Design a binder for this molecule. Sequence first.
Ligand code: 420
Ligand code: C8E
Ligand code: C8E
Ligand code: C8E
Length: 262
Amino acid sequence: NDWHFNIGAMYEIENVGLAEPSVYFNAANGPWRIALAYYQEGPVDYKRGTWFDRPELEVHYQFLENDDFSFGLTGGFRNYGYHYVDEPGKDTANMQRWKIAPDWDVKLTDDLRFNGWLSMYKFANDLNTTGYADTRVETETGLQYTFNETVALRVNYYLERGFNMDDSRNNGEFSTQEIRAYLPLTLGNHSVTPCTRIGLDRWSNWDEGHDFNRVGLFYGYDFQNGLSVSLEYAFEWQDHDEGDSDKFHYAGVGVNYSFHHH
Ligand SMILES: *CC(=O)NCCNS(=O)(=O)c1cccc2c(N(C)C)cccc12
Ligand SMILES: CCCCCCCCOCCOCCOCCOCCO
Ligand SMILES: CCCCCCCCOCCOCCOCCOCCO
Ligand SMILES: CCCCCCCCOCCOCCOCCOCCO
C-alpha cells in the first residue's frame, strides 16, 4: 500500500529544572504502524544529578476503520535505563515496561462519538531499586462533540492504577482519577488545543493527595510541505502556597516531518 513515514524531535522542560530531549520515527502501511523512540530526562543544570533514558518500540494494528466503528491495538516495549548519582547503594538500573493497549472510536450520532484507549502494563527487573509497582492499568475514555470542521470538544475520564502481582509488595501502588477536557480548534494551517485536567481523586504510597489541576495550551503549525512544528505550555498545581505540592511548570517544542511513498 502507501508507505507513510514520520521523523521528529522534541524538547521538554519541567520545574517547580528537568530537561527532556527526545527523537522518534514511525512507518505505516495498510493496518500496520511501527514506531521507534528515544527519550532522556535529567536536571537542567546537569553539580549534576540522576537521569535516565527511555528507548521504546511500539507496534500498532488497525482491526477496523470506518465511520461507525474503528478499533486497534498497540503493543510496546520500553527500557528505563537509570543512572543514579549520590544515593547509597546502586549506580545504574534497567527496568522494562511491556504494554498492550486497545483503542476504539464509535459513532453515537452525526456529531457525537465515544472513544478511548486502555493500557495494561507489566514492569520487569530492578523494581526494588526503581520503586515501581509491577502491574498497572491506564485508561482515557469519553465523548467527542464536533461543532464543525474547525471546532470539537472532548471530555474524558482518566484512571491510572498501580497493583502488585507479587502480593507481598505494596511498592509503587497508587490510584489517580481525572476529568480531562480539550477543545481542538483547526484554523487553516494553525492548530490550537486548550486543555484542562481536574483531579477527581488520588491516593499513593508517597502520601500527592487531594485536588490537582492542570491547564495547558497546544499550538501547532503545518507548512503544507511535510514539515510541522509544535509549542505547548502547561501549568499544574495543588492549591499553591500551603496546599501541598503547590506549582509546576511545563514547556515543550516539537518538529515533525511527514513524507510518503507508493
Ligand atoms: C493542551 C493539550 O496538550 N492539548 C492536546 C494536544 N494534542 S496533540 O496535538 O496530539 C499533542 C501535541 C504535543 C504533545 C502531546 C502530548 N504529550 C504528552 C506531549 C500528549 C497528547 C497530545 C499531544
Ligand atoms: C530506518 C530509518 C530511520 C531514519 C531516522 C533518523 C532519525 C530519527 O531517529 C529515529 C530512531 O528512533 C530511536 C531508535 O531507538 C533508539 C535505541 O536506543 C538504544 C540505546 O541503548
Ligand atoms: C456543547 C457541548 C454539548 C453537546 C451536547 C450534544 C447533544 C446533542 O444531542 C441532543 C441531546 O439533547 C439533550 C441535551 O444534552 C446536553 C448535554 O449537556 C450540555 C452541556 O452541559
Ligand atoms: C469545556 C466543558 C467542560 C465542562 C466539564 C467539566 C467537568 C468537571 O467535573 C469535575 C467534577 O469534579 C468533582 C469533584 O470530585 C470531588 C468530590 O468531592 C468528594 C470528596 O468528599
